[PDB]
Design an enzyme around this catalytic site. Structure first.
Site, short mmCIF file in Angstrom:
data_model
loop_
_atom_site.label_atom_id
_atom_site.label_comp_id
_atom_site.label_asym_id
_atom_site.label_seq_id
_atom_site.Cartn_x
_atom_site.Cartn_y
_atom_site.Cartn_z
N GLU D 766 8.49 -73.83 2.81
CA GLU D 766 7.56 -73.74 3.94
C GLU D 766 6.14 -73.53 3.45
O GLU D 766 5.19 -74.10 4.02
CB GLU D 766 7.98 -72.61 4.88
CG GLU D 766 7.30 -72.66 6.24
CD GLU D 766 6.00 -71.88 6.26
OE1 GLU D 766 5.95 -70.77 5.69
OE2 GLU D 766 5.02 -72.38 6.86
N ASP D 767 5.95 -72.73 2.41
CA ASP D 767 4.65 -72.49 1.80
C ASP D 767 4.65 -73.13 0.41
O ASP D 767 4.94 -72.48 -0.59
CB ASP D 767 4.34 -70.99 1.72
CG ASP D 767 3.72 -70.45 2.99
OD1 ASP D 767 3.79 -71.14 4.03
OD2 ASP D 767 3.17 -69.34 2.95
N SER D 768 4.32 -74.42 0.37
CA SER D 768 4.31 -75.18 -0.87
C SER D 768 3.88 -76.61 -0.55
O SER D 768 3.73 -76.98 0.62
CB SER D 768 5.67 -75.17 -1.57
OG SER D 768 5.57 -75.72 -2.87
N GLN D 903 -1.04 -73.27 7.39
CA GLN D 903 -1.06 -72.34 6.27
C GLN D 903 -1.26 -73.08 4.95
O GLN D 903 -0.76 -74.19 4.76
CB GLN D 903 0.24 -71.54 6.22
CG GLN D 903 0.24 -70.43 5.17
CD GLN D 903 1.48 -69.57 5.23
OE1 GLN D 903 2.41 -69.85 5.98
NE2 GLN D 903 1.49 -68.50 4.44
#
Ligand SMILES: [Zn+2]
Ligand SMILES: [Zn+2]
Ligand SMILES: [Zn+2]
Lengths: 51, 50, 65, 1023, 50, 129, 114
Positions: D766-768, D903
């Protein structure tokens, strides 16, 4: 817990010189019969009211 | 839902709406309108899932 | 600062096309029409020219040492 | 004739273009400073109290006039050479201009002979000058001249350079003055608060606040219960709460009827009369005015020993300390009483519930203090101390009988260092004073990105202390619409406290109310002193900056005339705002500064005053001597503040007001030019913010500032501690119309990328994010890094001094193991030398009582090449040098990349072009993001932006990113894409690089704009 | 919105999906709702960590 | 073997009465005034100057009246002398802050009554502008 | 419920009762002047305070552009179709929901509730 404020509608302090005056016209009809019995009337009564 | 909200507003406008014994008129109106809008989102959202 | 030499996606040369791109714009040609003339069929290369800014023009205003 | 709806979209943006061309983005910064340096500085000097010295010899010193010259640099020679703003940053000295004051002294030695001498342009001190201001060296200069001075023409300015550091005065919201507010607090012993802070014009005396409170009914007593609720007013210099009724008696209204006349305007209404009855009982015993004055003085801060002194102290407190704004002389008793009665009257309405309580968060009740108003308060601190220094210096001279020279009396350091101190450290006031300082203002200007610089200049700060604590500044209020950007707010504990000014909104610079006051007199307006109290019952109250000017018989006619004058640029300026509280019969006119307002198209009889001819002139705005100011002159557009916006109807677009099947509102007074202007600098650059989630828009505001890019054009000449510049800052494929005014197109902070949203090899969570190694090798996101090292060799001590030379191993005793071949004969590394790891770049030694090495090494272990070297002389005259080390950072697996919304995602893995999933046409995506981010911590605008980018690139036209443009739609974009042989939804068949078989799922690929954030792995690891 | 308006649009009801696009009035109302969540989230972590 | 959190310290300090940072500044000022002018002596020690700046910077009160009012207000309660100066010097914003900073208060003070005390201190402390 | 001022010093006339004539008369304290009261009422207090808002509404709200206008309900004594309406502005009546109509005529200023 309920107070007199939640059950009361309005209040006023009226003046009545003699006990039989009852300056308020609307209540004069019912106060008269109730007041016929000398309850607490053995002596002078102040001319103030807290209706 | 928008028409229903207007109808509820109109009822309160004309004093036709009756508050529930456990709530006041202003709060009761906010509750009725919230359910109509909340229900619409769930119903429309559920249809989207299908 | 300056137009990149080639497309970062595939590698097609785009720096040389910048000089012709500006020349075509002042020639009453449409922004997209100029790209077709230069031969940029892919949208990746058209990006390098359609929406490019030549900052070196303002830097060259300042005098050198 | 009229603007057709099919043409309104282009017409509306034309008028906005003129507004920014004339006003600009930093007009609010410059205007306030211009007012401060033009009138406020003169007012402080002019309004100074006379200087009196005694010990027969009487000395009276007065300041006649103030003269201000353009900035100059004073070296050891003392010549007044001009001081360019760029030179200040390089030499690390404050950019400021000299201050000169004319001093006239009259001396009398009891000889009945008065003689005076003239001192022309006394060197009182100096005043820092905001860049691009009226007194700045770069005012009214063409773009060509700015380049010659090594200054960016696109730089808006509006900041102060102190000790080489650019500082921006953050606006501090404060409660509006000369305004009556009623708030309800459940913690206080009293039910209601009659808070009203009153101050004179700009500032003659420190602000004084009085709270006319009303005791709560909760308390019970023998006499308290009978009278019940009584009003008590606390004076500024009286510790105890004195009844308000007694105050009026002290003014001179001995008669009790006069007290009711000023408070109760409508005698027919008995509900309000009963409330004031209990207040009279407490003050009844005090009948005579002298007794009332005696009563107030009894509880004074410093009661007088003798009885007569108590009356005098009370007389001064009420006359001067109390209600300074309404009256400061000794013949304003009638005026002061009327305002005092109004405060009680306002309390009565709130107590009875007939008037709604004032909203704490209402911006109309809050004023914004800019560099002008802020510096005006500071200037009084040094000036007041300046008189004391002159008085103290002369005191020892006067008693000795000899005259004292003024050259020694006036202190330049206090004026110069006093302003420079706070502007540098950020702590306001005087650190000598025993009170708590104000931190967080005059912060270091953020020059990482141009958008960040613009946002910082327009930055706002919520009030601190009791005002902020009681209210909810963090929560978003409705008044922010069109004035403060809602989306933009820093993320963290201080969320919502710091905000940004709206693009079109600007803060009133300020003006004198004298022209407005004189206007009313010639009309039917009648002052209070002339009329009896009975005439206020039916008439409407008129207020000018919170002052009781007097009632008016007919409110409709006067306001219509007043509105006409405002539209005609008559004696009433367009900046001035008039507010018509119809439900309260109150007309409020405000002329003081700090009022945030925005332009609005005027609508008359459901018809716009802006006609086609006005737009036609605007279309040819250049070379035609036509500007935005002409529009206000013609009356088509005026300015509405928060209070006036309270009673002003608005329309989103002309299509809403032109006609409707069911008339929502048949009386529209104003129409918004375009709703998108509510967004701030950072929010304006976001396409389809409405399609985006609110937190994501707020998140981008933080990320946008952290984005790295070309902050200005003159980066090479200047020296900055941190400066990231992108190799290829490319304007986006999808851009908003407001982006043009921000000039972000000229100086973008990101590079577009053909982003395919897929889960490739499972290297992106999700964060990449997954990058393309081949693309980076071609310059996909590479950027430079600049770190400036500063050092000066100063003779701090007579025995020991610093010098610049090569620290040879023999002559130097103490040294650190490092390579010293880099340094030259002068101890400074020449430009063009590669530096890696721990290396000395500047040689400095101290001749301790043999020398000890104290050179400066690289802050980190990064390998960089020195770009340029600068040698200068500091303000103290000692040799001072600066060198900028340039290093190249290649994007890698640890760098953090963030889209324009959502993000930030770290580069999970880099893949070569072969390994990336190529499509049918052979287009390997530059970046691959995790699809699982889109649902929650991302927005559909990313997919829409991808679709728009594909159409924009294919059709060769920059897409429109207007948040509320009905022309742009998802279906419309899909139809356009289908015409170029592409899927209407943008999905494409991507062939996996490793295995050539087609992927079952068709990936969605599009040219999405992306920006590189300052957060990089190399900086963290190298540390 | 007119004075004393209790309709859906006036009181912040957002009838437009993200894909369709929100009206200018809805955008500000959406921001107000999102602002509360951010404030609650900011304090929630501080309190929960304690 | 001593800890301020547990109210354990040498028995000598029990007889001593705590002083506020602002109040100490007044005492230092009185000491400074006499030394400067009343008697011709050596300049005051560097230690005296260092504490004078600390007290002035952290002085939460303007005049003696504000200091006396807070001292009298807190004296009415059962506040320990150690907490008397510590609470005033710290000036906790809310009751929750004071208890965490001052573990002793949590022993004999409720979350409501103490909040009514800290806010009173706020009304007394004077800000620059 | 009302307040009366004496003619001597214009001060409050607190209610006072005499024992000789047995008549309530409003008498000032500082000044010897005293006047009889014919109302025979000292004060009233409505706990529920259900006071009609029509007297509170000001007739000058007709020209307000923000207030909505509806032609369904015309003025009683004018016949004009246009009529501005709005909800109660009193916080006491905030619990209740009602509409108050005012004639839009320039000089009528009539207020009525349906
Ligand atoms: Zn390409
Ligand atoms: Zn009298
Ligand atoms: Zn009528």
């Amino acid at each position: 817990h309920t107070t007199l404020r939640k059950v009361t509608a309005n209040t006023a302090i009226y003046y009545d010189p003699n006990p039989q005056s009852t300056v308020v016209a609307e209540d004069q009809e019912w106060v008269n019969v109730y007041y016929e019995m000398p309850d607490f009337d053995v002596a002078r009564i102040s001319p103030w009211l807290l209706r | 839902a928008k028409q229903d909200v207007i109808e509820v507003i109109e009822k309160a406008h004309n004093n036709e709406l009756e508050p529930t014994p456990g709530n006041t008129l202003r709060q009761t109106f906010e509750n009725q309108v919230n359910r109509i809008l909340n229900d619409a989102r769930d119903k429309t959202g559920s249809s989207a899932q299908k | 600062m300056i137009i990149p030499v080639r497309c970062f996606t595939c590698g097609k040369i785009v720096g040389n096309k910048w000089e012709a791109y500006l020349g075509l714009l002042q020639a009453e040609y449409t922004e997209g029409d100029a790209l077709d003339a230069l031969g940029l069929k892919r949208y990746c290369c058209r990006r390098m020219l359609l929406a490019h800014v030549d900052l070196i023009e303002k830097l060259l205003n300042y005098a050198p040492l | 004739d009229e603007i057709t709806p099919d043409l309104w979209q282009e017409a509306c943006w034309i008028v906005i273009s003129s507004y920014f061309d004339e006003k600009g983005l930093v007009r609010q910064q410059l205007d306030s400073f211009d007012e401060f340096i033009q009138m406020s500085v003169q007012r402080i000097v002019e309004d100074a109290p006379p200087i009196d010295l005694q010990a027969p010899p009487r000395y009276l010193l007065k300041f006649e006039q103030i003269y201000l010259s353009k900035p100059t640099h004073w070296e050891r020679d003392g010549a007044p050479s001009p001081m360019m703003p760029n030179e200040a940053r390089l030499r690390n000295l404050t950019y400021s201009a000299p201050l000169y004051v004319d001093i006239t002294k009259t001396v009398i030695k009891e000889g009945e002979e008065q003689l005076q001498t003239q001192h022309q342009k006394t060197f009182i001190g100096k005043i820092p000058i905001m860049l691009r201001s009226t007194y700045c060296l770069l005012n009214g200069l063409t773009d060509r001249d700015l380049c010659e001075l090594n200054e960016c023409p696109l730089d808006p300015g509006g900041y102060f350079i102190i000790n080489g550091s650019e500082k921006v005065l953050i606006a501090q919201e404060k409660m509006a003055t000369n305004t009556v507010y009623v708030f309800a607090k459940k913690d206080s012993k009293y039910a209601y608060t009659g808070e009203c802070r009153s101050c004179l014009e700009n500032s003659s005396r420190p602000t004084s606040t009085i709270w006319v409170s009303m005791l709560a009914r909760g308390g019970q007593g023998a006499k308290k219960s009978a009278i019940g609720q009584r009003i008590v007013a606390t004076l500024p210099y009286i510790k105890q709460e004195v009844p308000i009724i007694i105050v009026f008696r002290a003014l001179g209204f001995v008669s009790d009827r006069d007290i009711l006349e000023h408070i109760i305007y409508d005698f027919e209404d008995p509900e309000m009369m009963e409330m004031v009855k209990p207040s009279l009982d407490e003050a009844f015993v005090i009948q005579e005015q002298n007794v009332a004055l005696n009563f107030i003085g009894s509880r004074g801060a410093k009661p007088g020993v003798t009885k007569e002194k108590r009356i005098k102290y009370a007389k001064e407190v009420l006359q001067k300390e109390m209600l300074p704004h309404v009256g400061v002389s000794d013949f304003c008793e009638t005026k002061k009483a009327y305002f005092l009665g109004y405060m009680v009257h306002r309390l009565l309405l709130a107590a009875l519930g007939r008037r709604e309580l004032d909203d704490r968060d209402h911006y109309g009740n809050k004023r914004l203090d800019l560099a002008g108003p802020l510096l005006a308060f500071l200037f009084r601190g040094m000036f007041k101390n300046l008189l004391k220094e002159v008085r103290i210096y002369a005191q020892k001279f006067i008693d000795r009988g000899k005259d004292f020279n003024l050259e020694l009396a006036i202190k330049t350091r206090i004026i110069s260092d006093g302003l420079k101190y706070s502007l540098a450290t950020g702590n306001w006031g005087d650190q000598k004073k025993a009170h708590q300082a104000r931190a967080g203002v005059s912060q270091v200007l953020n020059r990482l990105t141009f958008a960040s610089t613009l946002s910082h200049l327009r930055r706002l700060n919520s009030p601190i202390g009791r005002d902020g604590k009681l209210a909810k500044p963090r929560q978003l209020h409705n008044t922010l619409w069109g004035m403060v950007c809602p989306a933009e707010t820093p993320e963290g504990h201080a969320v919502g406290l710091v905000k940004n000014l709206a693009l079109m909104a600007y803060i009133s610079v300020g003006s004198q109310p004298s022209p407005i006051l004189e206007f009313l007199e010639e009309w039917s307006m009648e002052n209070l002193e002339e009329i009896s109290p009975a005439a206020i019952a039916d008439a409407t109250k008129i207020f000018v900056n919170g002052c009781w000017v007097g009632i008016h018989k007919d409110p409709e006619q006067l306001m219509n005339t007043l509105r006409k004058l405002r539209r005609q640029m008559d004696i009433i300026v367009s900046e001035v705002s008039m507010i018509r509280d119809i439900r309260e019969r109150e007309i409020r006119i405000y002329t003081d500064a700090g009022r945030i307002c925005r332009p609005l198209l005027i609508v008359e009889k459901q018809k716009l005053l802006l006609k086609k001819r006005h737009i036609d002139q605007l279309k040819e705005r250049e070379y035609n001597n036509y500007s935005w100011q002409d529009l206000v002159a013609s009356g088509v557009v005026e300015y509405i503040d928060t209070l006036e916006e309270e009673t002003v109807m608005l329309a989103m677009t002309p299509d809403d007001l032109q006609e409707k099947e069911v008339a929502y509102c048949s009386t529209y007074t104003h129409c918004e030019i375009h709703p998108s202007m509510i967004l701030g600098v950072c929010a304006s650059i976001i396409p389809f913010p409405d399609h985006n989630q609110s937190p994501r828009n707020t998140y981008q505001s933080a990320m946008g500032k952290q984005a790295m890019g070309v902050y200005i054009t003159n980066f090479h000449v200047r020296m900055d501690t941190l400066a990231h510049v992108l190799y290829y800052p490319q304007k986006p494929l999808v851009t908003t119309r407001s982006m043009e005014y921000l000039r972000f197109r000229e100086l973008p902070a990101g590079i577009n990328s053909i982003v395919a949203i897929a889960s490739y090899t499972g290297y992106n969570q999700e964060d990449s994010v997954i990058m393309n190694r081949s693309a980076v090798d071609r310059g996909f996101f590479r950027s430079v890094f600049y770190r400036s090292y500063k050092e000066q060799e100063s003779k701090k001590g007579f025995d020991q001094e610093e010098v610049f030379e090569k620290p040879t191993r023999e002559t130097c005793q103490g040294m650190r193991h490092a390579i010293y071949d880099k340094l030259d004969d002068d101890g400074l590394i020449a430009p063009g030398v590669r530096v890696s790891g721990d290396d000395v770049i500047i040689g400095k030694t101290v001749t301790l009582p043999t020398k000890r090495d104290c050179s400066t090494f690289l802050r980190t272990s990064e390998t960089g090449i020195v770009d340029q070297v600068m040698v200068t002389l500091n303000q103290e005259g000692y040799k001072f040098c600066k060198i900028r080390v340039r290093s190249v950072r290649i994007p890698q697996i640890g760098d953090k990349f963030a889209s324009r919304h959502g993000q930030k995602g770290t580069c999970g893995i880099q893949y070569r072009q072969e390994d990336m999933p190529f499509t049918c046409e052979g287009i390997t995506p530059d970046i691959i993001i995790n699809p699982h981010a889109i649902p929650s911590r991302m927005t559909i605008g990313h997919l829409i932006e991808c679709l728009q980018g594909k159409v924009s690139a294919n059709k060769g036209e920059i897409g429109d990113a207007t948040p509320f443009n009905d022309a742009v739609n998802v279906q419309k974009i899909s139809n356009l894409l289908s015409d170029y042989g592409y899927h209407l939804r943008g999905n494409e068949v991507l062939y996996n690089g490793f295995t050539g078989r087609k992927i079952t799922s068709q990936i969605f690929i599009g040219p999405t704009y992306y920006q590189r954030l300052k957060h990089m792995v190399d900086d963290k690891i190298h540390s | 919105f007119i004075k004393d308006d209790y309709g859906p649009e006036s009181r912040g009801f957002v009838e437009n999906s993200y894909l369709a696009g929100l009206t200018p009035t809805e955008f500000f109302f959406h921001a107000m709702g999102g602002r509360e969540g951010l404030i609650d989230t900011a304090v929630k972590t501080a309190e929960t960590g304690y | 073997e001593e800890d301020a959190s547990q109210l354990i310290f040498p028995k000598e300090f029990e007889t001593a009465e705590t002083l506020l940072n602002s109040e100490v500044h007044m005492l230092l000022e009185h000491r400074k005034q006499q030394n400067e002018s009343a008697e011709d002596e050596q300049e005051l020690s560097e230690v005296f100057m260092k504490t004078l700046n600390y007290t002035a910077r952290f002085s939460r009160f303007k005049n003696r009246e504000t200091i006396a009012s807070v001292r009298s207000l807190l004296l009415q309660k059962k506040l320990h002398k150690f907490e008397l100066a510590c609470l005033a010097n710290l000036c906790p914003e809310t009751a929750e802050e004071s208890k965490a900073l001052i573990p002793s208060l949590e022993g004999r003070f409720e979350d409501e009554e103490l909040q009514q005390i800290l806010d009173d201190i706020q009304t007394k402390r004077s800000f620059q502008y | 419920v009302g307040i009366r001022f004496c003619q001597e010093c214009n001060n409050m006339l607190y209610p006072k009762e005499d024992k000789e004539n047995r008549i309530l008369l409003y008498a000032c304290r500082n000044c010897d002047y005293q006047q009889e009261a014919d109302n025979s009422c000292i004060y009233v207090n409505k706990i529920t305070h259900e006071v009609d808002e029509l007297t509170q509404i000001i007739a000058d709200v007709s020209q307000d552009p923000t207030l909505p206008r509806t032609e369904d309900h015309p003025c009683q004594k004018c016949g004009h179709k246009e009529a501005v309406f709005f909800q109660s502005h009193s916080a006491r009546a905030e619990d209740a929901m009602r509409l108050y109509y005012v004639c839009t005529a320039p000089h009528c200023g009539h207020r009525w509730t349906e």
